[PDB]
Amino acid sequence: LPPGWEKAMSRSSGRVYYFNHITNASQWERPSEPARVRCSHLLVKHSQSRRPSSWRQEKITRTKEEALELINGYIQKIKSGEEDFESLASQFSDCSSAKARGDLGAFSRGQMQKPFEDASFALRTGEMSGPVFTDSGIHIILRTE
Numbered sequence: 001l002p003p004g005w006e007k008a009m010s011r012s013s014g015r016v017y018y019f020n021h022i023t024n025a026s027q028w029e030r031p032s033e034p035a036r037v038r039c040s041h042l043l044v045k046h047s048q049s050r051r052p053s054s055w056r057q058e059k060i061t062r063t064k065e066e067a068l069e070l071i072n073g074y075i076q077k078i079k080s081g082e083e084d085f086e087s088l089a090s091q092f093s094d095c096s097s098a099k100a101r102g103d104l105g106a107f108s109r110g111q112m113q114k115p116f117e118d119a120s121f122a123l124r125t126g127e128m129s130g131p132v133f134t135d136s137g138i139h140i141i142l143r144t145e
């Protein structure tokens with residue numbers, strides 16, 4: 001299996017699925033390094049974020065658990081296609097990159113927060129992460145290049 005993937009069993013349905021413990025991605029099909037990657041993200045901050053402030057909210061007060069619930073809901077909408085990642089990033093990301101549809105540009109290893117970097121470089125081109133935790137908050141990461 002590709003880097004960081006394991007087999008798991010669905011608790012509701014009993015069907016086998018696959019889980020990546022670096023990106024927190026999960027998918028039903030069996031899963032299919034560069035100097036740099038290009039990613040977008042959607043950040044949901046919380047009261048324990050290193051800077052609990054954003055363009056959306058001068059004082060961010062939501063709990064870490066409430067932030068995770070928001071992230072999980074956004075992931076549901078992106079995967080069902082009801083909403084686009086770029087649309088939700090522009091509207092709801094607590095990062096200044098919201099105004100760029102969440103795009104962060106290209107980057108190398110040794111520039112970004114470690115959990116963010118590890119998830120970014122473990123994603124395949126076009127693939128989206130599950131919830132990724134850093135000192136800034138909780139992220140959904142989309143690798144675009």
Ligand SMILES: O=C1[C@@H]2C[C@@H]3C[C@H]1C[C@@](O)(C3)C2
Pocket residue numbers: 041043095104111112113116136137
């Ligand atoms: O929320 C974030 C902060 C700003 C940039 C995007 C993401 C990860 C990072 O390391 C770089 C810290």
Ligand SMILES: [Cl-]
Pocket residue numbers: 123124125
């Ligand atoms: Cl790839």
